[PDB]
Amino acid sequence: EPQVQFKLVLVGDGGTGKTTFVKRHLTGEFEKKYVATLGVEVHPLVFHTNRGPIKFNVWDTAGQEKYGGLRDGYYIQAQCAIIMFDVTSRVTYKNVPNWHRDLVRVCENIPIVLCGNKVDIKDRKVKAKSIVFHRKKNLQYYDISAKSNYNFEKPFLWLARKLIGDPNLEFVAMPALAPPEVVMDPALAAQYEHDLEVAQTT
């Protein structure tokens, strides 16, 4: 018996929280592989479903997105992807179309998730109404906080359901995660859940 394994590319501007987000899955960080000529660290994030074990091999940069773009070797062969931005920084959000363009050019029709990070910070700039454009382009969206573990499993459970072709797939136990470094206020989570429903119903 082989192993069900998927290449996932994690892309987005420098300073958005990619490396902090991938590092929450503790065993993936313990067993990572550094490849210097690609400019990447590959993290084996294993998840446990109702039909069995799955592995997402997550590609995280070495910081080369701050002074340029990524080569075609980073993207080639991906089976899925996560594009991240920071919700307190608008310039990170306005560069999302160009990240989506590179994934489309090299990979064509793969399932892609858009993540808005740092939702624990009180003064938020980019809200739920500005995400509607990307939903009409066929991206899936989640509000994320890497430091408190808020919605960590969401992007991985949607991508597993798409790849396997099963809308009733579930995770039967959670992976060991790095203890929260900040508290996600419960009044801010209740308000942001309401903003998203308003925007995508009405």
Position with the least CB separation from ligand GDP: 17
Ligand-binding site membership of 117 (annotated)? yes
Element (H, E) at 129: none
Q: Which does 145 bind (CB under 5 to 8 A by kind): Mg ion, ligand GDP, none?
A: ligand GDP
> Is 49 assigned to a binding site?
no
- Closest CB to Mg ion among 54 and 146? 146
In the complex, what is the shortest distance from the CB of residue 87 to ligand GDP, in angstroms, rounded to a whole number?
10
Query: Does 64 engage in binding with Mg ion (CB under 5 A)?
Result: no
Of the residues 4, 6, 19, 184, which one makes contact with Mg ion according to CB under 5 A: 19
CA distances from 127 to 14, 22, 201 (A): 20, 23, 16
Rounded to 5 degrees, φ, ψ at 7 are: -80, 120
Q: Is residue 143 within a helix (H) or strand (E), and if so which, with residue range?
A: strand 140-143
Name which of 32 and 161 has its Cβ closer to ligand GDP.
32
Q: How far is the CB of 10 from ligand GDP (least distance, A)?
A: 9
Residue 41 binds what, of ligand GDP, Mg ion, none (CB under 5 to 8 Å, by partner type)?
none
Q: What is the spatial distance between Cα 163 and Cα 146, in angstroms, rounded to a whole number?
A: 24
Residue whose pair of structure tokens reads 């050019």 in the numeric block: 105
> Binding partner of residue 69 among ligand GDP, Mg ion, none, CB under 5 to 8 Å per kind?
none
- Beta strands at 112-117 and 5-11: parallel, antiparallel or unpaired: unpaired
Q: Tokens 């809308």 sit at which residue? A: 167
User: What is the spatial distance between Cα 188 and Cα 90, in angstroms, rounded to a whole number?
Assistant: 20
Residue 125 contacts residue 90 (beta carbons within 8 Å) = yes
When CB distances are held under 5 to 8 angstroms depending on the partner's kind, the choice from ligand GDP, Mg ion, none that residue 4 binds is none
Residues that bind ligand GDP (CB under 6 A): 14-20, 117-118, 120-121, 145-147, 182
15 contact choice in ligand GDP, Mg ion, none (CB below 5 to 8 Å, kind-dependent): ligand GDP
User: CA 115 to CA 167: how far, in whole Å?
Assistant: 21
CB nearer ligand GDP, residue 19 or residue 130: 19
Query: What's the rounded Cα separation, in Å, for the pair 79 and 107?
Result: 8
By C-beta, is 14 or 53 nearer to Mg ion?
A: 14
Positions that interact with Mg ion (CB under 5 A):
18-19
